[PDB]
Amino acid sequence: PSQNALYLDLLKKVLTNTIYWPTVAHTMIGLERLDNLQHCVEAVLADGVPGDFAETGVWRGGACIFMRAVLQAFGDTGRTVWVVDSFQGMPEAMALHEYNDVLGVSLETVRQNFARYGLLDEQVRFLPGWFRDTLPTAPIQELAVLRLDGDLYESTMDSLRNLYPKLSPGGFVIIDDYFLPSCQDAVKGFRAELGITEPIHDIDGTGAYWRRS
Amino acid sequence: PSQNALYLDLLKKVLTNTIYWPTVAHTMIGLERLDNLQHCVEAVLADGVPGDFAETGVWRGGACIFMRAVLQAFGDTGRTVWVVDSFQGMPEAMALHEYNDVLGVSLETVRQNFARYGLLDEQVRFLPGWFRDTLPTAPIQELAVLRLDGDLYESTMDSLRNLYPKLSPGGFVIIDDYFLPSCQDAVKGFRAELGITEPIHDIDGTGAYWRRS
Ligand SMILES: Nc1ncnc2c1ncn2[C@@H]1O[C@H](CSCC[C@H](N)C(=O)O)[C@@H](O)[C@H]1O
Ligand SMILES: Nc1ncnc2c1ncn2[C@@H]1O[C@H](CSCC[C@H](N)C(=O)O)[C@@H](O)[C@H]1O
Ligand SMILES: [Mg+2]
Ligand SMILES: [Mg+2]
C-alpha cells in the first residue's frame, strides 16, 4: 500500500548518519540515492516483479540494510537480499582504489551492522569473494533489483555479465557511479554487446538506472 | 491500534545511539526507560486520558523527542510536548552537579536535535528557565504524562508541586531517578503532604512511576 513510511524515512536519516567517506555512516550513497533505491524496490513489490535483490559492492552494508528494511516495512517475507562483496575492499590505475582499502569492511562487521537494525535474519545472504570468482556460479536464481556499486570497470562488467541475465523483466538495474568513467565504459560496453536500449534515467548526476522491458 | 511499531523501535535504538554520559546520544535514559515512556504514552492515548506531555529535565531532548514521535506514530495532532529545562544545566552538595555542566545543552541545540528527526513543529513547546521561576506560572493547563528527570531534591519538588495538580486522573508520573536519594526524598516528602497513595511501580531499579487514580 505504501506501508511504514515513518520507519523508512527515519532509516534513511540513520544510515547516512544525518542524526549524529562518512566516518561512521553505514552507507556512503546519500539520501537521494537511497530514495531512488526505495522507489525501485517499492515499484517491484507493487508491480509483482519476481526475484531477489542484490548489491555488488556493499561497504558497510547500508544500502543492503535498507533493501532488507523495505521488505520488512512491506511484510514481504519471501524475497532475499544478497550482500555481495569481497569484504576486503577493492582489488588491485585503474584510479588506484586499493590505496584506500578502508573501503575494506569484514563480513563480521557487516553482519554486526545488520544486527544493529534488528535485520540480520533468513532473508539476508552474504556472498563473499571477488566478483570474478563468485558471480559466475552465484546461487542466485532471479533478481528483481540489481544494484552495482563497485567503482571499477571490471567490477561493473563482472556484475553485469553474470547477474543481468537473472534480472526479471520489469526489474531494475541501478548504477551507483554511472558518471565515473570506468563504471560508465563498462555499462555502455555491456549495453552495446547485448543490444540493450532501455533508456538510462539519471538519479542525481552521479547514479543512474534503468528498468528492464 | 498500536501503530508504526517499526518506526518507534528504530527510534529508541537511535536516540540511545545503539546504532553507531552517552557522548553523542540524545537521551541518557536507556532503552528500558524509553520502553516505559512508550507504555505510558500509549496507555494514555488508548484510554483517552486528556492532556499534554511534559518533561522537567531534558538534556539533549531525547526523551521529549520520543514522546513527540509516539504522537506522530499514532497520528494524534492535538497534544503538546512541553520541553522544560534551564537549557544551562544544573543549578548551584547537593551532590555537586553543576561541576559537570556539560549537562548544559542550549535551547538552540535541543531545537536542532528535534529538527534532525523531522519533529520540530507546532506540537513541541519549550519552557526555558529555572523550574522555581518557570513552573509556578507555567502556561500548561493539563497533563496526561509528567516525566521528572531533574536529579536534585529542589528540581523534583518544584516540578511536583507545580505540575502534579495539572495531571489528569489516569495520567502518569514518571520519576527517572527514584532511587537517587534527593529525588526519592522529594517524592516521598511530596506524596506524604498531599496523601498520595497510588503505588509506585519500579521500572528498572533506577526509575519508577505511578498512575493517578
Ligand atoms: N571485484 C570486486 N569483488 C568483490 N568486491 C568488490 C569488487 N570491487 C569492488 N568491491 C567492493 O565494492 C565496494 C565499494 S563501496 C560501496 C559502498 C556504498 N556505501 C554502498 O552503500 O554500497 C567495497 O565494499 C568493495 O570491497
Ligand atoms: N531546577 C532546574 N531548573 C531547570 N532545569 C533543571 C533544573 N534542575 C535540573 N535541570 C535540568 O535537568 C536535566 C537533567 S539530565 C535529563 C536528561 C535525560 N537524557 C533525559 O533524556 O531526560 C538537565 O538538562 C538540566 O539543565
Ligand atoms: Mg558508489
Ligand atoms: Mg535521570
Distance CA B171, CA B185 (A): 22
The CA-atom distances, in angstroms, between A34 and each of A170, A204, B141 are 20, 11, 43
Which residues, listed in sequence order, are joined to residue A52 by a DSSP beta bridge? A143
Burial environment of residue A78 by CB neighbours within 10 A (0 to 12, 13 to 18, 19 or more): exposed
Q: Which residues of A touch B14 (CB under 8 A)?
A: 10, 14, 19
Residue nearest to atom 9 of ligand 1 (CA): A150
Answer whether A120 touches B (CB < 8 Å): no
For residue A108, give the H/E element and its range: helix A107-116
The closest CB to that of B19, out of A4, A7, A14, belongs to: A14
List, in sequence order, every residue forming a beta bridge with B126; answer none if it has no partner.
B83
A116 to B72: CB separation less than 8 angstroms, yes or no: no
Interface test with A, best of B8, B15, B19, B109 (most A CBs within 10 A): B19
Coil, helix or strand for B96?
Answer: coil
Cell numbers describing residue A124: 539476508
Chain A closest CA to B61's CA: distance in Å?
13
Q: Would you say B136 and B161 are in contact if contact means Cβ atoms under 8 Å apart?
A: no
Q: Residues B86, B130: contact at Cβ < 8 Å?
A: yes
Q: Which three cell numbers stand for residue A76?
A: 514481504
Residues in B 69-98 with any Cβ partner in A closer than 8 A: 72-73
Closest listed residue to residue A92, CA positions, set A63, A132, A141? A132
User: What does the longest C-alpha to C-alpha distance in chain A come to?
Assistant: 47
Which residue from A25, A5, A28, A3 is spatially nearest to A14, judged by alpha carbons?
Answer: A25
Confirm or reject contact between A109 and chain B (CB < 8 A): no
Q: What is the resolution of this structure in A?
A: 2.0
Q: Alpha carbon A69 to chain centroid distance?
A: 13
A15 contacts A65 by C-beta, under 8 angstroms: yes
Q: What whole-number distance in Å separates Cα of residue A162 and Cα of residue A184?
A: 17
Hey, what amino acid is at B21?
W
User: CB of A62 closer than 6 A to ligand 1?
Assistant: yes
- In chain B, which residue ranges form alpha helices assigned H by DSSP? 5-15, 30-47, 62-74, 107-116, 131-134, 153-163, 183-194
d(CA A90, CA A92): 7
- CB environment B23-36: b (16+ within 10 A), e (fewer): eebbbbbbeebbeb
> In sequence order, what are the beta bridge partners of A208?
A175, A202
Asked if B18 has any chain A CB less than 8 Å from its own CB, the reply is yes
Between β-strands B208-211 and A81-85, what pairing exists: parallel, antiparallel or unpaired? unpaired
Asked if A150 and A160 count as a contact pair (C-beta separation under 8 A), the reply is: no
Q: Is B176 annotated as a binding residue?
A: yes
Per-residue cell: A86: 569481497
**Grid coordinates representing A42?**
517499492
Q: Are A180 and A97 in contact (CB under 8 A)?
A: no
Measuring CA to CA, how many Å separate B56 from each of A12, B26, B64, B84, B200?
31, 15, 10, 5, 19
Residue in chain B nearest A6 by alpha carbon: B7
Q: Looking at the DSSP assignment, which residues form a beta bridge with residue B41?
A: none
Nearest 5°: phi and psi at B141?
A: -100, -50
Is-contact A37 A97, C-beta < 8 A? Answer: no
**CA distance readout (Å), A79 to A36, A71, A117, A171, B133:** 19, 8, 18, 14, 58
Q: How far apart are CA B186 and CA B42, in angstroms?
A: 27
Torsion sign over Cα A25, B6, B117, B211: negative
**Polymer length in residues for chain A:** 213
A24 vs B contacts (CB less than 8 Å): 20
Chain-centre distance of CA B28, in angstroms? 12
**Cβ density class B169-198: b for 16+ within 10 Å, e for less:** ebbbbbbbbbebebbbebbeebbeeeebee
Determination technique for this entry: X-ray
Q: Which residue in A has a C-alpha nearest to residue B24's C-alpha?
A: A20
Closest to B6 (Cβ–Cβ): which among A24, A73, A116?
A: A73
Which among B4, B20, B116 has the least Cβ separation from residue A6? B4
Q: What is the dihedral of CA A106, A109, A113, A115, to 10 degrees?
A: 120
Residue from B54, B177, B62 nearest B123 by CA: B54
Q: What share of chain B is helix, strand, coil (3-state, %, to 5)?
A: 40, 15, 45
Sequence spans of domains, chain A: 1-213
d(C-alpha B33, C-alpha B176), whole Å: 8
Using a CB-CB cut-off of 8 Å, the residues of chain A touching B11 are 10
